[PDB]
Amino acid sequence: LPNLQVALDHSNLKGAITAAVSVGNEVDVIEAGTVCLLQVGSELVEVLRSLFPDKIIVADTKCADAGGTVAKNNAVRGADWMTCICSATIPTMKAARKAIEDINPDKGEIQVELYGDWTYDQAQQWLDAGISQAIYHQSRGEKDLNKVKKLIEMGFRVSVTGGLSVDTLKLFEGVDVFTFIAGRGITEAKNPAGAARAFKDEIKRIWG
Amino acid sequence: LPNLQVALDHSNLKGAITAAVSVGNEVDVIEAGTVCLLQVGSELVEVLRSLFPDKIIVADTKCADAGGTVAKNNAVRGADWMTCICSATIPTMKAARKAIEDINPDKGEIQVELYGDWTYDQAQQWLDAGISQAIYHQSRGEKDLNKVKKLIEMGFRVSVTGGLSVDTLKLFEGVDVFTFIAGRGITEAKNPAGAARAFKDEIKRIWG
Numbered sequence: 001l002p003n004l005q006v007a008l009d010h011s012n013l014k015g016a017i018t019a020a021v022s023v024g025n026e027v028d029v030i031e032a033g034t035v036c037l038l039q040v041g042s043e044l045v046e047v048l049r050s051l052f053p054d055k056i057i058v059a060d061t062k063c064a065d066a067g068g069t070v071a072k073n074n075a076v077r078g079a080d081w082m083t084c085i086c087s088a089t090i091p092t093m094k095a096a097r098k099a100i101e102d103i104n105p106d107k108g109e110i111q112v113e114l115y116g117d118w119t120y121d122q123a124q125q126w127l128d129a130g131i132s133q134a135i136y137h138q139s140r141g142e143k144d145l146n147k148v149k150k151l152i153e154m155g156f157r158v159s160v161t162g163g164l165s166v167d168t169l170k171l172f173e174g175v176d177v178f179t180f181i182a183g184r185g186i187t188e189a190k191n192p193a194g195a196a197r198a199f200k201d202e203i204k205r206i207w208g
Numbered sequence: 209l210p211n212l213q214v215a216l217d218h219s220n221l222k223g224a225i226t227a228a229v230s231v232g233n234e235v236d237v238i239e240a241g242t243v244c245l246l247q248v249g250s251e252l253v254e255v256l257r258s259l260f261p262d263k264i265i266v267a268d269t270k271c272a273d274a275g276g277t278v279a280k281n282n283a284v285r286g287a288d289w290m291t292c293i294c295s296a297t298i299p300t301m302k303a304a305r306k307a308i309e310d311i312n313p314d315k316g317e318i319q320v321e322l323y324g325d326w327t328y329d330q331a332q333q334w335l336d337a338g339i340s341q342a343i344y345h346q347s348r349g350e351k352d353l354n355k356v357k358k359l360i361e362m363g364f365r366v367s368v369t370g371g372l373s374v375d376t377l378k379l380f381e382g383v384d385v386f387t388f389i390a391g392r393g394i395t396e397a398k399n400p401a402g403a404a405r406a407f408k409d410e411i412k413r414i415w416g
């Protein structure tokens with residue numbers, strides 16, 4: 001079944017912790033968003049790990065460089081997955097993958113954040129480098145779905161994000177989407193917990 | 209004259225503050241580096257601003273998205289310049305620019321961090337969005353030097369960085385480099401304050 005993921009893009013610590021706590025049990029994956037990490041730093045990751053010793057935890061660093069160092073700094077905090085921006089060189093991605101695998105051999109992975117003009121040849125390089133997650137951001141239609149389908153076809157576990165709603169999941173019917181990332185659709189609600197069960201309920205209806 | 213900038217890429221706050229305090233008067237620009245911000249959050253910017261009321265301070269966020277939030281978050285902390293990764297979309301770069309100018313009308317600017325396969329038509333797009341700084345990274349030679357000249361010639365103030373020794377500023381002679389960014393050559397020297405002087409002295413012979 002497609003994972004439900006919550007992205008915490010709050011500009012402060014309390015916002016991220018409060019949303020995480022109110023939706024934690026309704027979701028599969030918890031993501032410390034980039035906006036948030038740039039504000040509060042990496043301790044946030046260790047807090048999420050303590051609150052959710054079993055959840056999958058994402059450190060959304062959008063790493064462009066010093067991959068071994070950034071990957072390491074977040075892995076010691078308890079992160080399972082870290083994002084690298086697609087414009088990171090292959091050596092950066094491999095340095096990052098190596099480090100998250102050393103600290104976290106259980107679950108350590110890199111996910112590629114897809115921004116601007118990337119290519120399928122680049123996509124093949126990521127795969128050849130041991131990296132098979134990619135995150136596809138909804139365009140700001142069929143042009144998007146085809147990109148998602150092709151990335152799946154190539155061997156990626158594909159996460160999709162960018163304005164989602166409990167009612168716009170059926171648009172992905174028959175697609176092997178690995179993870180749905182909901183941010184604001186949950187992190188403003190309320191009964192965010194219920195909003196999140198809603199999302200998870202729809203996924204169940206459509207993929208069960 | 210070409211600026212000298214130190215990149216604070218430490219994985220902890222004490223490392224960033226110590227290096228800044230010890231080399232700050234030797235440099236023209238102080239940069240809170242991505243690795244560091246991802247660790248300690250944006251308060252670092254505020255304490256640098258407090259330590260150096262007049263210096264130019266860089267928040268190296270390599271923002272890929274939510275440009276308005278990330279630029280504001282760092283501008284209210286006192287940042288003068290903020291990096292966006294070259295794969296961020298134009299609207300993202302515009303939102304970032306508008307936020308930083310809104311809070312820092314005097315010195316507020318965006319810098320484009322060049323990673324991966326960017327184009328001169330992307331480059332031109334940045335200029336049209338009112339953004340005129342780029343930061344070019346040495347590759348892991350003539351090919352590099354030539355890219356810098358072309359960027360200067362389009363109307364960017366180009367910053368150059370990547371394993372810069374002082375002994376390697378000579379190969380840029382007669383090139384209108386706007387800023388040289390030194391990280392480890394300053395921050396891991398055995399005389400950091402001396403190393404920084406070596407750098408800006410060498411720059412003083414060659415240019416001006």
Ligand SMILES: O=C(CO)[C@H](O)[C@H](O)COP(=O)(O)O
Binds near residue numbers: 066217369371389
């Ligand atoms: O910070 C970086 C990562 O984006 C640059 O590589 C750094 O600014 C250059 O530092 P050094 O002189 O140690 O290569």
